[PDB]
Structure formats: C-alpha cells, structure tokens
C-alpha cells in the first residue's frame, strides 16, 4: 500500500519561471518490474490542472529511460542513460500555456528539449516548483486500472545539485520548501532532505 508517492522538496509560490538541477543516475535493484523516477517540475501539488516536468526512470533490471511531460496533454519518452551519469534537467514556463523541458546528459554530451505551445487541455498555475523522487503508476489503456509500480531500491542517493528556481526572473531559495517522503506500508522508503542548493534523497 503506497501512502505517499512523492519524495522531495516542493516550493509554493507564484509566477514560477524556471526550475532546474543536475541529478546523478543511481544503480537500481529489486526486480525488472521495480522502478523509480527523479524529475524537476512546475505545478502538480496545489495546482491540480497541469504539471510541466522532465526527468528519468530506473528499473530494477538495470535499464533506464528519459522523458518529458506536460500533463495531462503531451507525455513522451525523450539520450542514453547509464549508472553514474550526471543529468541536467530543466523546465521553463513562459506563460500558463507555453514553456519547455530540457534534459541533458552531461556525461555523454547528449541533449534533448521540447518546446510546448497553445497548451489547451490543461494550463499551468505556476504556483509549485519541485525536485522529486517518485513511485510512479502504470495504468491500462482506459485508466480503469492504475497501480503504483513496485518501488526499486537505489544507490547511492539521488542528489539534485545546483537546484535553481526563479519567480518573475528572481531566484527563489529552497529554505522554505516543504519536504515529502515516499511512504509504503506505513514506512518511509526515502529520506529526502534539503541543504543549500542541494536536494538529496536516499533510498531507505
């Protein structure tokens, strides 16, 4: 029973412009069907109408993938990812219906980005900025059956370094971010903490 599916730091505010950080790719275990994801994004907490996010997943069989998403509208897999790579992730919201997502593997020199525009079926409020480790869901075709994927164990800790959030061009500190942890079977399965411009999340 997954009681909390997000672990990480969430800032609440207004006019969030860009959210970016560099995260390391961990090794994962627990089975080919166990997984986890690390991503940076805008909205999706107190703003339930949309979320601009980009990041990567790890599966217990040692495989990975990268993606971007403007929920609920455009969602898709982006670059090659290997254990130990350093991935710079970033989203920018130029308006409630326009922005971009960029994922750069600083280790391989590969980079992908997607520009979004005229996003109708779901606009941003630009009131939440976040750095998250998540136990995501797997749904069938018609949303009639959605379930959380078994959460993979990972090592070392996934650290979002050089975190940067801006609101109206002004940079915002992580000082007052709310902290959440992934919780399964009434047990914390992450220990995410903030320190300076770093959000560090250890698997528990």
């Amino acid at each position: 029973t997954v009681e909390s599916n997000w672990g990480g730091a969430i800032l609440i505010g207004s006019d969030f412009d860009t959210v970016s950080a560099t995260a390391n790719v961990p090794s994962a275990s627990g089975g080919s069907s166990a997984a986890g994801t690390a991503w940076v994004g805008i909205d999706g907490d107190t703003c339930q109408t949309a979320i601009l996010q980009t990041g990567f997943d790890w599966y217990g069989d040692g495989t990975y993938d990268a993606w971007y998403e403007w929920y609920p509208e455009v969602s898709d897999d982006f670059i090659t990812i290997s254990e130990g790579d350093s991935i710079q992730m970033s989203v920018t919201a130029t308006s409630d219906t326009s922005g971009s997502a960029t994922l750069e593997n600083l280790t391989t020199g590969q980079k992908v980005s997607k520009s979004f525009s005229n996003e109708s079926s779901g606009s941003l409020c630009r009131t939440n900025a976040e750095f998250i480790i998540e136990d995501f869901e797997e749904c069938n075709s018609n949303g009639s059956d959605c379930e959380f994927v078994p959460f993979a164990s990972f090592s070392p800790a996934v650290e979002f370094t050089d975190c940067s959030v801006t609101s109206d061009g002004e940079s915002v500190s992580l000082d007052d971010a709310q902290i959440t942890q992934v919780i399964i079977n009434n047990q914390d399965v992450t220990d995410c903490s903030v320190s300076g411009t770093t959000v560090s999340c250890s698997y528990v």
């Binding site: 599916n5 997000w6 969430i10 994801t37 991503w39 999706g44 907490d45 339930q48 979320i51 996010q53 990041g55 997943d57 993606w67 998403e69 929920y71 969602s75 998540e134 995501f136 869901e137 797997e138 749904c139 075709s141 959605c146 959440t180």
Partner: peptide, 7 residues
C-alpha cells in the same frame, strides 16, 4: 501506459 501523476 506509465502515469508518472499528481501528488
């Protein structure tokens, strides 16, 4: 499909 989802 993968529902990477609201908090």
């Amino acid at each position: 499909f993968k529902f990477x989802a609201l908090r």
